[PDB]
Amino acid sequence: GYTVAVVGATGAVGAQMIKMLEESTLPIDKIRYLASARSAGKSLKFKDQDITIEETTETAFEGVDIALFSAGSSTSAKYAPYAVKAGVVVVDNTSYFRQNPDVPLVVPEVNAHALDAHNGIIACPNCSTIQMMVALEPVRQKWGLDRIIVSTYQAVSGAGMGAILETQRELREVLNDGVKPCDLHAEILPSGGDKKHYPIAFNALPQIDVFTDNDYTYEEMKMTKETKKIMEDDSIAVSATCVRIPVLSAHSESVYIETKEVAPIEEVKAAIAAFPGAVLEDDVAHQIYPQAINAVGSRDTFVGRIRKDLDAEKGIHMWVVSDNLLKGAAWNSVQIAETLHERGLVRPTAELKFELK
Amino acid sequence: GYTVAVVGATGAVGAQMIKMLEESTLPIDKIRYLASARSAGKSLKFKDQDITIEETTETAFEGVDIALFSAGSSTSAKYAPYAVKAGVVVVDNTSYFRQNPDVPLVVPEVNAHALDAHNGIIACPNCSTIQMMVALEPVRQKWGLDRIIVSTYQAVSGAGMGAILETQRELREVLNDGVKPCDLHAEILPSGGDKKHYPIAFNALPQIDVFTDNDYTYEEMKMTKETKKIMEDDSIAVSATCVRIPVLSAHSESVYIETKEVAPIEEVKAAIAAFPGAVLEDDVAHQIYPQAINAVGSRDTFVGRIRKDLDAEKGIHMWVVSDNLLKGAAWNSVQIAETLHERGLVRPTAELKFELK
Ligand SMILES: Nc1ncnc2c1ncn2[C@@H]1O[C@H](COP(=O)(O)O)[C@@H](O)[C@H]1OP(=O)(O)O
Ligand SMILES: Nc1ncnc2c1ncn2[C@@H]1O[C@H](COP(=O)(O)O)[C@@H](O)[C@H]1OP(=O)(O)O
Ligand SMILES: N[C@H](CCCC(=O)O)C(=O)O
Ligand SMILES: N[C@H](CCCC(=O)O)C(=O)O
Ligand code: NA
DSSP, X not given: OEEEEEETTXXXXXXXXXXXXXXXXXXXXXXXXXXXXTTTTOEEEETTEEEEOEEOOTTTTTTOSEEEEOSOHHHHHHHHHHHHHTTOEEEEOSSTXXXXXXXXBOXXXXXXXXXXXXXXXXXXXXXXXXXXXXXXXXHHHHHOOSEEEEEEEBOGGXXXXXXXXXXXXXXXXXXXXXXXXXXXXOSSSSOTTSSOOOXXXXXXXXXXXXXXXXXXXXXXXXXXXXXXXXXXXXXSEEEEEOOBOSOSSOEEEEEEEEOXXXXXXXXXXXXXXXXXXXXXXXXXXXXXXXXXXHHTTOSSEEEEEEEEXXXXXXXXXXXXXXXTTIIIIIHHHHHHHHHHHHTTOOSOOSSOOSOOO | OEEEEEETTTSHHHHHHHHHHHTOXXXXXXXXXXXXXXXXXXXEEETTEEEEOEEOOTTTTTTOSEEEEOSOHHHHHHHHHHHHHHTOEEEEOSSTTTTOTTSOBOOHHHHGGGGTTOOSEEEOOOHHHHHHHHHHHHHHHHHOOSEEEEEEEEOGGGGOHHHHHHHHHHHHHHHHHOOOGGGOOOSSSSOTTSXXXXXXXXXXXXXXXXXXXXXXXXXXXXXXXXXXXXXTOTTSEEEEEEXXXXXXXXXXXXXXXXXXXXXXXXXXXXXXXXXXXXXXXXBGGGTBOOOHHHHTTOSSEXXXXXXXXXXXXXEEEEEEEEOTTIIIIIHHHHHHHHHHHHTTOXXXXXXXXXXXO
């Protein structure tokens, strides 16, 4: 079997990575948990076994077959190249290596073929991107994609464990203490690294990550750039507005598309239903549509509210929901590892293509 | 001065109609509060005065100069024509009369001119529609509007007092009692009249109002049809996705437009800031954008995140927020009444144009 390491085991994604690995078919002989120095020494469960958390260092990756990273882009930048040097296949859940031409950016149902030519690092895409790709690929395959306009309704767990606790605390202060939402104190959201912080309780914050030079945030631009790489088509127009709402788990997305050829709605519904990883939840007569609360805990991506634009001949609207910690992160990563196993791609990489920092 | 009646004075909008009237310049000699049988006999304040709530009847409008309705479509259908017959000028905050050619559908900053030929009823547009009209009218005036795509982030107060209480209860059950969102019992949302009811706590519900036969909801279709009437241009392509989120007050909207002529963003920002009722909150370098929690209690409409589409030459994205009970309802209605007073338009209508039910 394999030696599997989880880097960032104590985090929000790391917790789900453990859960997904527990429920995985992957033949695991040895499991290892890695985090920062302050977590080292603590005990954490794998099934019923007790595992001691280790500190992530440059020499900690010897003998490891597969490493799942979700400890922020700074940890991946620093330790992933040393892992590859040690002969590990890295599945990275950060944005750091995503736009590197030597790194496959993979959603297994969409571009598993890209895994074959990997150089030791496989990048897991952004959570907001992944669920959109699962929903849209079956459409692209049959009728093509000209443009995408998406407005997101993102859960706070995407920003990590602290964001969840901040959201819960804020909501308690308003409902129990009667504090006006606009008077709340925030420490993390919208972006932990940005200069100013705003309450999320009873609010919709149109900022996820920091702003780029073009007045779109990095989150919005990641949706643009990642879609183009995943679907291997730079001609797909993508513009996004990414908004945080008071949901703890599961992203929701209002997705507008224009196809190359006119796509009959009932055929679109059927194509999405037939696509692996995508589940059609669309029966408006009985008020059936994807819901954040229903998607929590499931690996599947749920699609509904499918309808043609009222004016644009090739325009289609839809509603896409998936657990952001599962398909958006931990499950996509474990599924990548399972696909690597399937294809016999779990082995050391001879040529080191990533500079050691 | 005027005798002013508030129909639906006890409701979520009604409470704000009282506040807006209390802060109004309108010469009010007498105030009357009208509701249903179950509120009849109870007392509510107007400033320091105690006002006895009366049951709304076909004979309850004698001596009334102005009546502000917000008691549901059925109430307006039943009683508004009897008010018009009595000599009242009705400002109606329901969808019932909005698409009647004999009824002005007014946002005062946009189409106040339509008030002049009123036949006793002026319809206040849908709350989600109004704020979009305030943001986009200054853009339309200078560069035209070819199309609108909108995804909304709507507050629960739009669905009435019960929906607010349901939302607070559900959140309290999750946060204080540790109830799972899936296990919550809902009675009103997404739509009180519809067959099935879903939790809103930590959820995003892509249904507002009932579904129509084209698979768009009535809320989505009202945004489409009201836009065309208010802007007096049936050629403006409009498609909407309307979603309820865990917010009590203030709607947020991700608005995509394509103009007729290329609209420089810096000029677009200036045009919006110069438009009455619209405030520019757009300074991304300092993370300044409209927020629901900041908009609560303000009559203004806040616009930000203004940026051109990444591919479409004439495409512009923006973020629009306003208090749905104020500009979306109570303030727009009071502003209509004030504009009616300004133009000497508060007087009986000789010819009845509306059916007595
Ligand atoms: N320098 C680091 N090396 C290894 N892991 C890190 C480092 N910095 C942060 N992490 C881990 O990344 C994760 C962040 O997740 P979240 O955003 O949900 O808190 C945590 O598990 C955290 O572990 P630790 O608990 O030791 O800080
Ligand atoms: N048949 C009716 N006649 C007059 N007012 C009504 C009628 N039915 C409901 N209303 C009023 O419409 C408003 C609905 O508000 P909300 O949507 O916030 O619950 C309430 O003020 C309610 O008054 P009441 O309080 O007597 O039921
Ligand atoms: N999507 C971000 C978190 C994931 C950041 C990334 O992998 O690019 C969020 O919701 O805040
Ligand atoms: N906008 C609706 C309520 C107002 C219904 C209307 O005036 O047509 C909501 O948010 O639930
Ligand atoms: Na499927």
